[PDB]
Amino acid sequence: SWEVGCGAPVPLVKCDENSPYRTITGDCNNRRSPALGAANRALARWLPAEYEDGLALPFGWTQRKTRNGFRVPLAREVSNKIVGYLDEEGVLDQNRSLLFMQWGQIVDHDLDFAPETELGSNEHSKTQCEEYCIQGDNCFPIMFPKNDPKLKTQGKCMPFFRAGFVCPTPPYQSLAREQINAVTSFLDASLVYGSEPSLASRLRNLSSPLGLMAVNQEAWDHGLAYLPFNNKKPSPCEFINTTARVPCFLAGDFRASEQILLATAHTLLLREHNRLARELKKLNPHWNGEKLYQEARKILGAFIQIITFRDYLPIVLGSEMQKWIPPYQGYNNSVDPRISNVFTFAFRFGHMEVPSTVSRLDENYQPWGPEAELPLHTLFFNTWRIIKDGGIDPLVRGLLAKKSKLMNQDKMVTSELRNKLFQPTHKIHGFDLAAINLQRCRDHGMPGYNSWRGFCGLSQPKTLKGLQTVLKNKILAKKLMDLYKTPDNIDIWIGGNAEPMVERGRVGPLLACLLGRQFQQIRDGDRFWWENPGVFTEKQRDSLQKVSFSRLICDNTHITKVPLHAFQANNYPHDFVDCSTVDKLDLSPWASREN
Numbered sequence: 001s002w003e004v005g006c007g008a009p010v011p012l013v014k015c016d017e018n019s020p021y022r023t024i025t026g027d028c029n030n031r032r033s034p035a036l037g038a039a040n041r042a043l044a045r046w047l048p049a050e051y052e053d054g055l056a057l058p059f060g061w062t063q064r065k066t067r068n069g070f071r072v073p074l075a076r077e078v079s080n081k082i083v084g085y086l087d088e089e090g091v092l093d094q095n096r097s098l099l100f101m102q103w104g105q106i107v108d109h110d111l112d113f114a115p116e117t118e119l120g121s122n123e124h125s126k127t128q129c130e131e132y133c134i135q136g137d138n139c140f141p142i143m144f145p146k147n148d149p150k151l152k153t154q155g156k157c158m159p160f161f162r163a164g165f166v167c168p169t170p171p172y173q174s175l176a177r178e179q180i181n182a183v184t185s186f187l188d189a190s191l192v193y194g195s196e197p198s199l200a201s202r203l204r205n206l207s208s209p210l211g212l213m214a215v216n217q218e219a220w221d222h223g224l225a226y227l228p229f230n231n232k233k234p235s236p237c238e239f240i241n242t243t244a245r246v247p248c249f250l251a252g253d254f255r256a257s258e259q260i261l262l263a264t265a266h267t268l269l270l271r272e273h274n275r276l277a278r279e280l281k282k283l284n285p286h287w288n289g290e291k292l293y294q295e296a297r298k299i300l301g302a303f304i305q306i307i308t309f310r311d312y313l314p315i316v317l318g319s320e321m322q323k324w325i326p327p328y329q330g331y332n333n334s335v336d337p338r339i340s341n342v343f344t345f346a347f348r349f350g351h352m353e354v355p356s357t358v359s360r361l362d363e364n365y366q367p368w369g370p371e372a373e374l375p376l377h378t379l380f381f382n383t384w385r386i387i388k389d390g391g392i393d394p395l396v397r398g399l400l401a402k403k404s405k406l407m408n409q410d411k412m413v414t415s416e417l418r419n420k421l422f423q424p425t426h427k428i429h430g431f432d433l434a435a436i437n438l439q440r441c442r443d444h445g446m447p448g449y450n451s452w453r454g455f456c457g458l459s460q461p462k463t464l465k466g467l468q469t470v471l472k473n474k475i476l477a478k479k480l481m482d483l484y485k486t487p488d489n490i491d492i493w494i495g496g497n498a499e500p501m502v503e504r505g506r507v508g509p510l511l512a513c514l515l516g517r518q519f520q521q522i523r524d525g526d527r528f529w530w531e532n533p534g535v536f537t538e539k540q541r542d543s544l545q546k547v548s549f550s551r552l553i554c555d556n557t558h559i560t561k562v563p564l565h566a567f568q569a570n571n572y573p574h575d576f577v578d579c580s581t582v583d584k585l586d587l588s589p590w591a592s593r594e595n
């Protein structure tokens with residue numbers, strides 16, 4: 001059992017044995033092991049890291065070196081052969097609104113982030129990785145296969161930099177390389193409030209004693225707040241459009257501006273915090289700012305938990321929901337609530353649910369203006385279309401009445417992501433998220449497909465014929481065992497996602513097991529779970545059961561027509577009801593009769 005307890009990219013820290021709130025860092029959730037689930041620590045290893053040298057080098061690094069006697073295929077080659085498709089007609093999910101995709105991304109962002117190594121940002125290092133395609137140290141470029149249109153138009157590779165690792169950022173040879181999780185493992189609204197003290201404070205409005213989050217001061221949304229702008233230059237949101245020059249937003253999580261709809265969902269979440277803090281004050285006008293901020297924060301975290309566990313997860317996991325996530329029995333302090341490395345890849349199932357276009361809709365849920373539907377790629381890091389082009393209401397209707405992409409074994413990831421991705425240093429709409437997913441699954445040292453089938457107690461196909469029955473699909477299996485020569489070598493991202501979905505849910509068996517297990521643990525291992533006896537009063541809990549994403553939308557925008565079940569596919573006006581019929585969060589059980 002070779003290592004004990006290293007801990008470098010963290011500060012302190014010491015714990016507050018009631019202090020009815022979460023820390024910002026996630027520390028002091030577990031009493032016995034107060035770092036467990038804290039941000040800026042190693043991702044959990046559910047299985048030992050698997051690298052080409054047993055320590056750090058990703059499979060595929062050394063040309064000569066095989067995985068189980070075979071070369072691992074180029075990540076872009078797998079992407080082109082298997083992941084890509086041309087025809088967007090037919091690809092939509094008849095049963096899930098766009099919001100289903102979106103909440104996926106939100107939750108994902110509350111739970112995990114393995115950021116690239118920052119070492120030598122001011123070095124020829126990016127210049128040598130991006131310009132020359134030279135693999136070495138933290139440069140692990142995605143090379144194009146010989147028939148790739150991108151060879152002709154973009155150059156020899158897409159640059160790709162390896163994920164940071166814990167202890168120090170300088171090269172690691174004594175135990176295996178462990179990637180960092182930069183946000184809190186608890187489902188806690190950290191994407192709203194920050195996972196570091198240094199950002200948590202900046203986000204806040206300390207100017208007034210009202211516990212508000214800072215809001216944008218440049219611009220409004222029909223009297224509704226936007227998120228403050230980031231400061232930093234050079235800003236990729238400015239970069240898209242140097243005429244409009246609108247910076248990215250500043251949120252609790254750094255990726256909040258990555259696509260317009262994510263920014264939209266972040267905006268709704270911040271408004272809800274200020275709305276709660278207002279209500280709490282109106283009702284407790286002795287509470288101070290700090291009380292008001294924690295108390296709103298606490299409620300918002302419970303809302304994110306409830307929405308996720310009651311409304312999202314059952315329609316991801318389907319028939320497997322009760323198997324992995326049985327109803328709640330209380331806090332269990334032996335549970336490890338840390339996000340595992342593999343989860344951060346299993347949750348990328350969301351990538352096949354992203355459709356090629358986004359729509360703005362007006363109050364009749366009709367096209368809003370002349371160019372109301374746009375290609376997804378024009379919306380990466382695009383804040384200008386919000387501030388300058390209608391606010392969030394039109395985008396939110398789109399969320400409600402357009403549908404997610406459906407995962408499809410022949411049509412996996414839209415070319416909007418597979419060919420047109422924009423990354424905030426690289427200056428082009430030319431990257432391939434799928435290729436990146438696969439390179440990163442190698443970067444992070446993932447065990448292969450069958451390792452994971454084994455972990456979850458499933459069959460482990462060894463032959464083409466085996467893989468055909470598991471996937472149900474002769475030709476997908478054939479392509480996968482032309483590229484990988486054995487299902488042992490298939491990258492978990494693409495193996496998990498290749499499996500047909502389970503009844504009433506949107507992922508295959510292997511992923512339902514990986515996801516289901518993670519979420520059970522993040523709920524059961526959390527001292528501040530909304531439903532844990534003690535955390536909220538019973539009366540407070542009776543109010544919280546009534547929350548809905550419909551109501552969030554009603555309380556925070558000027559939309560008055562919403563569906564009752566926002567994740568299901570909905571059509572206007574048949575499936576839409578007026579906001580007055582929706583349950584409200586009743587805040588009266590938060591009144592502090594101290595008088």
Ligand code: HEM
Pocket residue numbers: 101102103104105108112113114115258259343344345347348349350351353354380433436437440
């Ligand atoms: C257009 C919408 C989206 C875009 C543009 C996008 C883009 C990206 C990018 C660029 C990365 C980093 C990849 C890397 O360097 O390895 C990433 C990672 C990730 N994505 Fe998405 N994504 C989208 C939607 C979603 C959805 C719907 C989900 C889940 C339902 C999701 C789940 C994740 C997760 C869990 C990761 C890893 C985060 C971490 O580092 O822990 N994404 N995505």
Ligand SMILES: *[C@@H]1O[C@H](CO)[C@@H](O[C@@H]2O[C@H](CO)[C@@H](O)[C@H](O)[C@H]2NC(C)=O)[C@H](O)[C@H]1NC(C)=O
Pocket residue numbers: 240241243244384388
């Ligand atoms: C960059 O943003 C600008 C301003 O936000 C966009 O310009 C608007 O687009 C149409 C003309 O194409 C007009 O209705 C608006 O008056 C334009 N405003 C200005 C100041 O030009 C422009 O489309 C965006 N450009 C790109 C390349 O994304």
Ligand SMILES: *[C@@H]1O[C@H](CO)[C@@H](O)[C@H](O)[C@H]1NC(C)=O
Pocket residue numbers: 205207208210212213214215216217
């Ligand atoms: C802080 O709150 C005050 C009044 O409550 C408001 O006028 C001001 O605009 C807020 N500042 C920020 C930066 O959100």
Ligand SMILES: *[C@@H]1O[C@H](CO)[C@@H](O)[C@H](O)[C@H]1NC(C)=O
Pocket residue numbers: 332333334335
């Ligand atoms: C808590 O979790 C542990 C380990 O997962 C399990 O063995 C134990 O039974 C659980 N304890 C309770 C009281 O539920």
Ligand SMILES: [Br-]
Pocket residue numbers: 255258
């Ligand atoms: Br992202």
Ligand SMILES: [Ca+2]
Pocket residue numbers: 110111183184185186187188189190191
């Ligand atoms: Ca979190």
